Design a protein around this nucleic acid. Structure first.
Ligand SMILES: N[C@@H](Cc1c[nH]c2ccccc12)C(=O)O
Ligand SMILES: N[C@@H](Cc1c[nH]c2ccccc12)C(=O)O
Lengths: 104, 104
DNA sequence: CGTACTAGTTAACTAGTACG
DNA sequence: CGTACTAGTTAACTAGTACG
């Protein structure tokens, strides 16, 4: 009896993270932006602004349900379906989401 | 006309950067992955996946224009229109592309 | 008070061929 | 031999209302 893969690494990284390695070369300076004008599009930083704005504004929960859609212009399907993604993720790394709002 | 500084206007984009400061908090550890599962989508690693595939395979030039389409499945309009993006970018920061192509 | 949902229109990307 | 084009389809995202 002998296991195939278990010691050192359990999950294998093939695509999304070899991209996060070149991102840390332009994150020390700030050259991942002319790099994003060659491999992706302006529509990727258009959907980062309004998507990161309904989550950064929902987690506060003061004026974010009926009265928020008029300020930016993002429907009630995106503002409350962004809430459905929070209940699927785990709590050990939802905990880091608290490490980046609370300010420690 | 002027020895130092030419034309005064001042301009800054605040959307992709509210996402780059919180991305640097999870880049020191590695919690930007549960982060990409609740405010990005699985199509955001399918676009960083296949878009980093036609550029990292075009810049070398071995099997990335005609014989590539069957190996993964992206069509000839993405692997040849991705070449048109390089002709628009500048050489001062395309130079950093050499800082991460030669070494990587 | 809050959420979920039913109806409403837009956007990128994919695939095999045409010519320089 | 290396690029770009004609024709083909596959997902994403907006908006305003009603019920628990
Ligand atoms: N994964 C997101 C999908 C999404 C696309 N565009 C959005 C804009 C805002 C919020 C969420 C989204 C969700 O279902 O929640
Ligand atoms: N700006 C890119 C947009 C793009 C979308 N999907 C792609 C796939 C591969 C390469 C580029 C892309 C282009 O037109 O080239």
């Amino acid at each position: 009896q002998s296991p195939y893969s278990a010691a050192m690494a359990e999950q294998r990284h093939q695509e999304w993270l070899r991209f996060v390695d070149l991102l840390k070369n332009a994150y020390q300076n700030d050259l991942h932006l002319p790099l994003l004008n060659l491999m992706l599009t302006p529509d990727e930083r258009e959907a980062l602004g309004t998507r990161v704005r309904i989550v950064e504004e929902l987690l506060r929960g003061e004026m974010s349900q009926r009265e928020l859609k008029n300020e930016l212009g993002a429907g009630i399907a995106t503002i409350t379906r962004g809430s459905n993604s929070l209940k699927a993720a785990p709590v050990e790394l939802r905990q880091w989401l608290e490490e980046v709002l609370l300010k420690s």
